[PDB]
């Protein structure tokens, strides 16, 4: 997250880290057994780490559970990142408590101008690399479809939205993929892609979770 602040240990209880020997993507817990993340985060042998703040220190509230099944969306296109969403089933159910909790799925799409919370352990520099130990947070607005389409000519589908700042300086960045964009207490977006991070006129692009809620619910109840 570039231009963010420190969330505070376990203040974002639905945030998870996907780990293959190191942290490489985030995700969000949507119930005791299922995590949603980005389809480009697919890897065999994912370990899901819940209850994390400092990803390098054991602080006592972590639960590490292997992924038993990852279900990439049927129409995911790895070239355009359209339908960039994946569900991960945990090998055993997480113990929900005050530090580990799920986030609600939306009943409606959020409108442009709604302020949302984006979080992750990704790069905090727009130029250079500084990867944080603790979870970072950013409040950012959903931008209009016109601005989004204007910023990325021909690359935005109906399954994507832009959130951030056209002035640059604040954005999600590498290592934040798959993590949450929460608006009004509902999961509205998944960190997906952008042209670098926090660049002028190149806001981050996010998977539009409200287009997938019936697919998510059907998949969770059937696997």
């Amino acid at each position: 997250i570039v231009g963010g602040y420190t969330c505070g240990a376990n203040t974002v209880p639905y945030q998870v880290s996907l780990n293959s020997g190191y942290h490489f993507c985030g995700g969000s817990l949507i119930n005791s057994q299922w995590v949603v993340s980005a389809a480009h985060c697919y890897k065999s042998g994912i370990q899901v780490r819940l209850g994390e703040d400092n990803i390098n220190v054991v602080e006592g509230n972590e639960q590490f559970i292997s992924a038993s099944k990852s279900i990439v969306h049927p129409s995911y296109n790895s070239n355009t990142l359209n339908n960039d969403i994946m569900l991960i089933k945990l090998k055993s159910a997480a113990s929900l408590n005050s530090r580990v909790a799920s986030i609600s799925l939306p009943t409606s799409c959020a409108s442009a101008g709604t302020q949302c919370l984006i979080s992750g352990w990704g790069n905090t520099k727009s130029s250079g690399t500084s990867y944080p130990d603790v979870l970072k947070c950013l409040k950012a607005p959903i931008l209009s479809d016109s601005s989004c389409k204007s910023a990325y000519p021909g690359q935005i589908t109906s399954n994507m939205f832009c959130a951030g700042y056209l002035e640059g300086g604040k954005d999600s960045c590498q290592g934040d993929s798959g993590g949450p964009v929460v608006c009004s207490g509902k999961l509205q977006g998944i960190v997906s892609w952008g042209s670098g991070c926090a660049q002028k006129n190149k806001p981050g692009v996010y998977t539009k979770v409200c287009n997938y809620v019936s697919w998510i619910k059907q998949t969770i109840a059937s696997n």
Binding site: Y22, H23, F24, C25, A38, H40, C41, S78, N79, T80, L81, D84, G122, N123, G128, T129, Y131, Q155, S172, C173, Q174, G175, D176, S177, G178, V191, S192, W193, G194, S195, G196, C197, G204
Partner: peptide, 29 residues
């Protein structure tokens, strides 16, 4: 550029996904 925000090590630009490139400190961006 279309560059997904996954953390990925690299030694050359061709190691990265889509239009991400390999930065000086060994990670795609």
């Amino acid at each position: 550029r279309v560059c997904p925000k996954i953390l990925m090590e690299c030694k050359k630009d061709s190691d990265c996904l889509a239009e991400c490139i390999c930065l000086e400190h060994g990670y795609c961006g």
